[PDB]
């Protein structure tokens, strides 16, 4: 009963901008917490000592840390590979 | 912290069978993706066989198929058959004209 919608024959099956999950930078979240810690307990307050120590280590060599999560989506490779098989087109 | 958000933990019902996969995050995501209001039919008067036009004087039932402002919901959302959607919309419009909805 759920209405199935069938597409006409198409020149391609492609996602214009495939969505990817970009994990947050660990150094930026540390900075966002330290900045908040100073907003409540005050700037240089002894309560944010650990945050300061962690932030320094995260950014010591690279201010954004070792970014090694770059990813690309494969939906368009599979979509183009499987479209002719799964589109349900009638025989020639 | 000894606390987890409910959205990050699955509560297995009592009397049900489970697999190790039911403790993974994939199960959480899979349950969200396939979360549809399929139990409405049993609680949906208009999907039971009644004629929606007999409820034109019962605004409480009709108010279940309109938005907060009174806009009739598209058939894509109500999930009714063409005939029931057609009859339900007439019932709501008649109810509005009588001064009840």
């Amino acid at each position: 009963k759920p209405p199935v919608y069938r597409l006409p024959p198409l020149p391609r099956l492609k996602v214009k901008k495939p969505i990817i999950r970009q994990e947050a930078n660990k150094c930026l979240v540390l900075m966002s917490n330290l900045l908040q810690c100073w907003s409540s307990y005050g700037h240089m307050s002894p309560k944010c000592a650990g945050l300061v120590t962690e932030l320094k280590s995260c950014t010591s060599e690279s201010a954004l840390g070792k970014r090694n999560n770059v990813q690309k989506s494969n939906i368009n490779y599979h979509a183009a590979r499987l479209y002719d098989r799964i589109n349900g087109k009638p025989h020639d | 912290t000894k606390k987890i958000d409910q959205s990050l933990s699955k509560k297995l019902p009592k009397g049900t069978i489970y697999d190790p996969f039911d403790f993974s995050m994939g199960r959480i995501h899979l349950d969200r993706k396939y979360q549809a209001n399929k139990n409405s039919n049993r609680n949906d008067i208009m999907k039971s066989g009644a004629n929606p036009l007999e409820f034109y004087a019962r605004p409480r039932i009709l108010s279940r198929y309109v938005t907060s402002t009174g806009r009739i919901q598209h058939r894509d959302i109500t999930g009714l058959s063409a005939k029931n959607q057609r009859r339900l919309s007439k019932a709501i419009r008649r109810c509005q004209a009588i001064g009840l909805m």
């Binding site: 799964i86 | 009397g15 697999d19 349950d31 979360q35 049993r42």
Partner: protein, 300 residues
């Protein structure tokens, strides 16, 4: 002939099933038949289906709905995990018992009409057991039946004036009784839902008869100890019992007096630890679920 052979083929033996392969509701029992392939056939992607299963599949168990589809693929899921739930139940050696003390469904007992005194309760269940019936097909149970019942009017207009004429001239309190019996007596010969689709007993989960003791090198086992997991750190809301995950089943765990202190400490990660439980009893409900009751055996 080829048609005769096909009816007996192994594929014909699998009953038609279109239930969703990806179901996210409550699962109480298996819904699909597990298919198994041997290691030699798996090496050649042979499963006895219409088409070869993709080589990516390394499991030897799958469940399927359709041999072929308009998408030119097989609809299958490479899992066979309901068998391990059944075998883990067998290892717990807890026979399934009736909480209502009913006769064993797997024995051909000589039953009598003790419960047949509710003829008006179940004779009308045929028309009143229509919870999920169409608004017009259920209405076809009103005219179709009325004609069938109305065809026995002459038979009951003579039997009642020949076997209980006094009631016809005094009161209908007994006449209604003779009516309910009449139709049932004239319906037992008929075939209305002659095949009952309700689950029979355990449904095949266990064929173990209660009574046997488990001999062990350390003596006869008096209490069955099974590792498990506590799911929630707070008793089920509105219920005086927590929930445990024992052997692929969710049980209700009753504690001796107090809840171990690891609960508060662990919190919502309590499921990360394994506890020892004792399985008190196991019952079967009409929905086809198993009601397993456990007890959190704590080191003492």
């Amino acid at each position: 002939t080829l048609a005769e052979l096909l009816g007996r083929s192994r594929i014909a033996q699998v009953a038609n099933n279109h239930k969703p392969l990806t179901y996210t509701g409550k699962k109480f029992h298996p819904t699909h038949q597990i298919i198994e392939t041997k290691p030699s056939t798996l090496y050649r992607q042979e499963w006895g289906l219409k088409s070869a299963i993709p080589s990516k599949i390394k499991s030897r168990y799958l469940v399927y709905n359709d041999l072929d589809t308009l998408e030119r693929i097989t609809t299958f899921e490479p899992r066979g995990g309901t068998q391990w739930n059944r075998l883990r139940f067998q290892e717990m050696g807890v026979p399934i018992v009736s909480n209502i003390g009913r006769q064993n469904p797997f024995f051909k007992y000589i039953s009598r009409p003790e419960d047949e005194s509710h003829a008006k309760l179940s004779l009308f269940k045929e028309m009143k057991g229509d919870t999920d019936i169409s608004p017009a097909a259920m209405k076809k149970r009103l005219k179709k039946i009325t004609a069938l019942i109305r065809s026995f009017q002459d038979e009951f207009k003579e039997w009642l004036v020949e076997n209980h004429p006094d009631e016809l001239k005094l009161n209908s309190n007994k006449l209604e009784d003779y009516v309910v019996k009449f139709l049932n007596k004239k319906l037992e010969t008929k075939t209305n839902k002659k095949f009952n689709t309700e689950i029979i007993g355990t449904g095949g989960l266990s064929y173990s008869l209660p009574g046997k003791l488990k001999n062990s090198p350390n003596g006869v086992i008096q209490r069955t100890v099974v590792p498990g997991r506590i799911l929630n750190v707070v008793k089920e809301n509105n219920d005086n019992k927590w929930l445990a995950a024992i052997g692929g089943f969710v049980a209700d765990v009753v504690f001796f007096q107090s809840p171990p202190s690891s609960f508060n400490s662990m919190g919502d990660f309590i499921r990360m630890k394994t506890f020892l439980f004792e399985i008190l009893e196991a019952s079967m409900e009409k929905n086809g679920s198993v009601s397993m009751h456990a007890r959190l055996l704590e080191p003492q």
